[PDB]
Amino acid sequence: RPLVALLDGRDCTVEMPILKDLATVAFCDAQSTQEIHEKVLNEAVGAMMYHTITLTREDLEKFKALRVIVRIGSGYDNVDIKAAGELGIAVCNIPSAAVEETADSTICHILNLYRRNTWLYQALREGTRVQSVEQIREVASGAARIRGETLGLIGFGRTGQAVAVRAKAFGFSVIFYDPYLQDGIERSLGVQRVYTLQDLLYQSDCVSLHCNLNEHNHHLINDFTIKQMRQGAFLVNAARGGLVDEKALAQALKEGRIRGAALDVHESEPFSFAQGPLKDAPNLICTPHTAWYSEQASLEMREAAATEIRRAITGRIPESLRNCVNKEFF
Amino acid sequence: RPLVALLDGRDCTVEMPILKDLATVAFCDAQSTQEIHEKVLNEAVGAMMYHTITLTREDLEKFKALRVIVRIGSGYDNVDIKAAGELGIAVCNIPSAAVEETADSTICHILNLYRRNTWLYQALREGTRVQSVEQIREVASGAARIRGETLGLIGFGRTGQAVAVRAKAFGFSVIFYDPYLQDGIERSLGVQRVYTLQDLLYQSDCVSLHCNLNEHNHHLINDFTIKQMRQGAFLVNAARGGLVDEKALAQALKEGRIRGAALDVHESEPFSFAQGPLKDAPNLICTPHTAWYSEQASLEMREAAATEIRRAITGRIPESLRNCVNKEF
Amino acid sequence: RPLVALLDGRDCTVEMPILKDLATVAFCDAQSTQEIHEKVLNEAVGAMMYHTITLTREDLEKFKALRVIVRIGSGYDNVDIKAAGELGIAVCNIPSAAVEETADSTICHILNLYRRNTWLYQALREGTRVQSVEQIREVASGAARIRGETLGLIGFGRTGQAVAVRAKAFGFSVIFYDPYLQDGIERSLGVQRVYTLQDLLYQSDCVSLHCNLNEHNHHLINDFTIKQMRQGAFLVNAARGGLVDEKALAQALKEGRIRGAALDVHESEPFSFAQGPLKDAPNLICTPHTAWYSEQASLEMREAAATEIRRAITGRIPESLRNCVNKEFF
Amino acid sequence: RPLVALLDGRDCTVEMPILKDLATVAFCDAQSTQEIHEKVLNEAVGAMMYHTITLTREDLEKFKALRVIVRIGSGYDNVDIKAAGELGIAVCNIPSAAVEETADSTICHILNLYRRNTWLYQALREGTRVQSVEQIREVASGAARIRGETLGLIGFGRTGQAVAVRAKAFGFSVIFYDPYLQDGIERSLGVQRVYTLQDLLYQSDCVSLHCNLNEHNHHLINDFTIKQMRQGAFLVNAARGGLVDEKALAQALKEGRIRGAALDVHESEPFSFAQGPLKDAPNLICTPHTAWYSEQASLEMREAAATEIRRAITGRIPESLRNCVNKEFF
Numbered sequence A, C, D: 001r002p003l004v005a006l007l008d009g010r011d012c013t014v015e016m017p018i019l020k021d022l023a024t025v026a027f028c029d030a031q032s033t034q035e036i037h038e039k040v041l042n043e044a045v046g047a048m049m050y051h052t053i054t055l056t057r058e059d060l061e062k063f064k065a066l067r068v069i070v071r072i073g074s075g076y077d078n079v080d081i082k083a084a085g086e087l088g089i090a091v092c093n094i095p096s097a098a099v100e101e102t103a104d105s106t107i108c109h110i111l112n113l114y115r116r117n118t119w120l121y122q123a124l125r126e127g128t129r130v131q132s133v134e135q136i137r138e139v140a141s142g143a144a145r146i147r148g149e150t151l152g153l154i155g156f157g158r159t160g161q162a163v164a165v166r167a168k169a170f171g172f173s174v175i176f177y178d179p180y181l182q183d184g185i186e187r188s189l190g191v192q193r194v195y196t197l198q199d200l201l202y203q204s205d206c207v208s209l210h211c212n213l214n215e216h217n218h219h220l221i222n223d224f225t226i227k228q229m230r231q232g233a234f235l236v237n238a239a240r241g242g243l244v245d246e247k248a249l250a251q252a253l254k255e256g257r258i259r260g261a262a263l264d265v266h267e268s269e270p271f272s273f274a275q276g277p278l279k280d281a282p283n284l285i286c287t288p289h290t291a292w293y294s295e296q297a298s299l300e301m302r303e304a305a306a307t308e309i310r311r312a313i314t315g316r317i318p319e320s321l322r323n324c325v326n327k328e329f330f
Numbered sequence B: 001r002p003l004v005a006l007l008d009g010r011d012c013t014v015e016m017p018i019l020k021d022l023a024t025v026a027f028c029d030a031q032s033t034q035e036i037h038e039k040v041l042n043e044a045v046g047a048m049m050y051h052t053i054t055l056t057r058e059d060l061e062k063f064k065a066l067r068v069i070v071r072i073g074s075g076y077d078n079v080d081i082k083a084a085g086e087l088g089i090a091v092c093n094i095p096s097a098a099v100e101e102t103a104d105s106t107i108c109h110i111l112n113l114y115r116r117n118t119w120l121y122q123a124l125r126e127g128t129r130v131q132s133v134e135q136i137r138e139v140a141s142g143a144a145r146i147r148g149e150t151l152g153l154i155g156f157g158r159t160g161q162a163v164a165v166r167a168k169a170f171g172f173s174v175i176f177y178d179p180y181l182q183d184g185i186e187r188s189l190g191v192q193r194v195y196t197l198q199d200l201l202y203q204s205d206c207v208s209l210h211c212n213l214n215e216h217n218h219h220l221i222n223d224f225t226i227k228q229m230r231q232g233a234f235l236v237n238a239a240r241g242g243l244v245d246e247k248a249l250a251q252a253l254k255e256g257r258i259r260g261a262a263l264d265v266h267e268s269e270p271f272s273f274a275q276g277p278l279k280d281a282p283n284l285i286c287t288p289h290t291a292w293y294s295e296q297a298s299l300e301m302r303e304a305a306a307t308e309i310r311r312a313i314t315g316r317i318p319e320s321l322r323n324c325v326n327k328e329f
């Protein structure tokens, strides 16, 4: 019976009752490739993982039979798809799982930067008897008006359009940018489209990031692109870790080029405010890689990722996979 | 020349140049009425106050030359408009100053409750190693999906429509209750309207107040209405704070009947978090009466109040005031 | 029992079994005060009319006490409310009845003017071979792009907001002008508000009227105002008829100052297309006063009028009515 | 550069001054391909067509020096892309121009059916005196309320999206059907997605077609699918013709199984109401294939087409073209 792993899992109680008989779901609870067991590394047909354990070219052959790797999530950047596509390993993922959640959390980070609700709550929990109206503006100094602030968006993916759809009502003027979309969407959703990155950086006040991390955009917003940002433009990042540089963003925050920046995923997981380059950065919000989560987007991505193992444990691989992301498979 | 006394503020550097020639502006900076200078109480004809000092009839009858009270904001509930009009004191206000900002900071409250982006930032400031994806769900246990929830707006004026317009895009099925509103505008915006609280609290996964406190809405959400909300339904209150029994909302939070509640204004300002009726409440966000503020909205709001006294120290009161609020003088 | 007229109706079908118990509905099908019978003049408690009969100060006094008149529809300009207010007669309308069918029809007119769909269907039912792509362009010559026009709504009540909500998605940039609205209704919906009619007519590619015809705007768009309109801007009147000049608009059409005009009402109804001041004007759409009709807009306003004549037959006068439109009695 | 033809046109006015230094544009006026030439047909270089002259396998073989085809439309059904690649020819189209016009004519064909602002204008262009409201309710008997109807649009591509953005404000509830989209698009715009076409026709008060016409779409609407539509649901075809079996749509109207149909293209073009399979159908509005036209989109698509041929006669085989088609190229 085809043992199906749950590599970085401890809770297999949604993938069990639908893989109850086709396979023996058995987690590994790993945090490193050298923390999986020999039983799984020698007999585990499929392995649904999460966004924490990272597999590399030299780890995909550290298995003995790995027909499929389902990524319970919207992004396959921690799996070397080009190695799996030649090691006889298809790599699925659940793209549509949390799109109305990443977009809500992103359009909430933008409002938490513009209106300073999180900083106000935090400065009210530290204790601040803010009573006089001259004493309110000194605790909300910077809370800007939204109507008419051009919103960059580096990439109309599924979760890039889902933010341009609900940020057009707040008054934002959206202008996306990504070179891989066909001439198109810019017209059907009613957003301007800039063709080169310098433009999106030069004419945007709240540059966001919604692009999947491939090998051509690693460290997209480094020190060289930050100097192209408008003077005092927020920077929300809910896409992926190695996308925005860290030392450079900290530098830009300390000086003042960035009037605030609410990262949501960091270059070093798990993030904390006591280690790393952002140790002393001002005007910085960070959530612990929680914009994909809800009570119904987990129950929907785990279910739909176990249904993906079901399809690959009976059907032909990879011609019976609803979401494979390497058709460079052999 | 007439004296125009700003009641609570050490800053008059926006309305001074707009009111330089006509009158002589002179701030008073009074956290209460017992700090008004005798000059600015015996010789001031016009007077603009923000929201902190509250003029009652026993107090509005002490100014002996006052002829207009420009109320900076959408408030005027801390000014006894009946008594004011009975003393020849026309009260106006600036209603359109911060609408696109109260609505934007009310939507952010609704999203900070549904996705918990300010309880996660806290848990990261308190220090929490959120490493394993089993711990992500334990630190964010409660974050919900928005598409489908029914947002119920008690009050559909300006700040109520401005939230229905921008919450219809997140999938929030909007629903409102407004008795004083001449029917036929739930048709334009496209939102179902209900006709009684017992019929709005009953179907609303996130009730948000947007009414103006008058002599008939005090403690609208009291101990008797919270027993009509759903079994767990967020409550946002970015509108004047004498609308929720704080001795009955904290009794519902510490019990689980309300799954969190972001209050923007309270009954007692300032709002020292450790002091008050809800000192020990769980799942509670509070900003300090700061949805109205913006570098641009706190300037349009003051220039347009200077311009209002420029019209009252020159025109016929109250037939010259652009938007007076007590034409019962 | 009290008699409840139906001054111009000939159905009294939906209104019959709502007040049959406590009133005897009876229709008259009149077109003037020259058709009503003697006893149903002075004592007839209530009457409910449509937009076809015009009652005047010199007519309502032929009714001693119409304890109520109910104006099925949304406009109460047929009856002198200032006259009824002095003869103990309270006027009522049904405002919320067809607020969105009027907006859908007004958007349909604005799109018929831009895309020329009903000028192309009419040029096909008239016979035209449109084979070559040159003739496609010479027959639909005038159709314009919509994204980036400045639709200007003269009047921002219910039917104005309902169009500003619907036309903000087509790319229009709404710009209204309303002198009676309080400050702020332009900040909630996000539509730039201009304050003087010249300032709305200068910057507008469509000037669609949505104001109720009161005493102070009869013939609002006359020759003088049309001379202020932008060179070649459409004009969609879907409001009361006597609001826009006939002769002046026909002049502006035949001349070129107006690139089309879809009028849903006219100065003199029933509007025939061969007798009138618009006898030979080019580029007109017209509809026979039908933007309020549906299979549901009727059952919602007729029932609502039948309910208004109950609320006004068991309860006291206008302090027990719902949509009273002249509180000016005493 | 060699002669670039303009097969389907008599006017090369904006294509030329952009191509004046590269090649010498000429035209052919071919209403059919056997009407082009014996010398251009031999050795031009390439071409740029419109949507009337169809080029088939046996006909593309007739050209002897064809490098590139450049449609000036949005679709390329009238060219055997699958055969043109095997022949040595690259095919290209201007994909995103008049996306804002097809989706403004489709939201007008949809309101022209729910409000009948083009049948009311017809019936009033024939002399239907309508003063009594009991007669207005007759001339417009059939107009319906929109808020609630479930507009179900086949093919959520580039205009299928631009229509679901415009018709989410009228109250429509949009649901699409598309089997070639990588799932996750129904959640960015908030439109419920159905998976089988029967599941789109069983719940749609107004079905609208927005799909390509490749090979598995011919007569998507048969006598076998119309039997699956709601009892009297409109049908708006503003896509390529050959998706609606006219012989079946001419029955579905003469019985009431379809309460209206706003076709914009047709099986055989040109179109006229006196020769065809639907010569006598009631409730049938049809425009002559001008849902794509404007004064700006018909200048944008025929400049982008003259730029995509400059890039193709200066660049390379389909590695320099921007919007190339036919991965069947060698």
Ligand SMILES: NC(=O)c1ccc[n+]([C@@H]2O[C@H](COP(=O)([O-])OP(=O)(O)OC[C@H]3O[C@@H](n4cnc5c(N)ncnc54)[C@H](O)[C@@H]3O)[C@@H](O)[C@H]2O)c1
Residues within 6 Å of the ligand: A074, A075, A076, A095, A098, A102, A154, A155, A156, A157, A158, A159, A160, A177, A178, A179, A180, A181, A210, A211, A212, A213, A214, A216, A217, A238, A239, A240, A264, A265, A289, A290, A291, A292
């Ligand atoms: N906060 C979270 O934890 C969370 C949750 C869900 C998704 N995500 C991330 O969001 C990312 C985007 O999600 P998605 O649904 O849009 O994936 P997607 O494949 O559907 O869309 C990504 C699009 O980004 C554009 N793009 C690609 N490379 C680019 C580049 N170098 N520069 C600019 N644009 C580029 C492309 O147009 C791509 O289509 C995912 O990779 C995923 O990792 C994060």
Ligand SMILES: NC(=O)c1ccc[n+]([C@@H]2O[C@H](COP(=O)([O-])OP(=O)(O)OC[C@H]3O[C@@H](n4cnc5c(N)ncnc54)[C@H](O)[C@@H]3O)[C@@H](O)[C@H]2O)c1
Residues within 6 Å of the ligand: B074, B075, B095, B098, B102, B154, B155, B156, B157, B158, B159, B160, B177, B178, B179, B180, B181, B210, B211, B212, B213, B214, B216, B217, B220, B238, B239, B240, B264, B265, B289, B290, B291, B292
């Ligand atoms: N967070 C802040 O500091 C802030 C900023 C701006 C406004 N506000 C408050 O928000 C309130 C609303 O602002 P606004 O611009 O909408 O004023 P508004 O008068 O235009 O809107 C009030 C609407 O609620 C209706 N209403 C009255 N009593 C009601 C009741 N008992 N139940 C339900 N509805 C009732 C009112 O008739 C009206 O429809 C203002 O009183 C203002 O004090 C607060």
Ligand SMILES: NC(=O)c1ccc[n+]([C@@H]2O[C@H](COP(=O)([O-])OP(=O)(O)OC[C@H]3O[C@@H](n4cnc5c(N)ncnc54)[C@H](O)[C@@H]3O)[C@@H](O)[C@H]2O)c1
Residues within 6 Å of the ligand: C074, C075, C076, C095, C098, C102, C154, C155, C156, C157, C158, C159, C160, C177, C178, C179, C180, C181, C210, C211, C212, C213, C214, C216, C217, C220, C238, C239, C240, C264, C265, C289, C290, C291, C292
């Ligand atoms: N096509 C139809 O048959 C049809 C259907 C419904 C309504 N209508 C007409 O549409 C009119 C408007 O409908 P409504 O429900 O919005 O009425 P409404 O009273 O609800 O709103 C009308 C708004 O226009 C304002 N206004 C008044 N005079 C003005 C002027 N001189 N210039 C600019 N604005 C002015 C009014 O103050 C108000 O703000 C109604 O009077 C009604 O007669 C026509």
Ligand SMILES: NC(=O)c1ccc[n+]([C@@H]2O[C@H](COP(=O)([O-])OP(=O)(O)OC[C@H]3O[C@@H](n4cnc5c(N)ncnc54)[C@H](O)[C@@H]3O)[C@@H](O)[C@H]2O)c1
Residues within 6 Å of the ligand: D074, D075, D076, D095, D098, D102, D154, D155, D156, D157, D158, D159, D160, D177, D178, D179, D180, D181, D210, D211, D212, D213, D216, D217, D220, D238, D239, D240, D264, D265, D289, D290, D291, D292
């Ligand atoms: N009225 C006009 O003259 C006019 C103007 C512009 C475009 N069009 C036509 O409209 C069509 C759509 O335009 P577009 O820009 O969206 O093309 P597109 O390729 O961008 O979008 C087409 C979408 O429909 C999908 N589809 C394919 N077959 C399908 C099927 N059997 N059922 C359901 N969906 C299917 C396609 O995969 C795609 O998702 C074009 O083919 C074009 O020919 C017509």
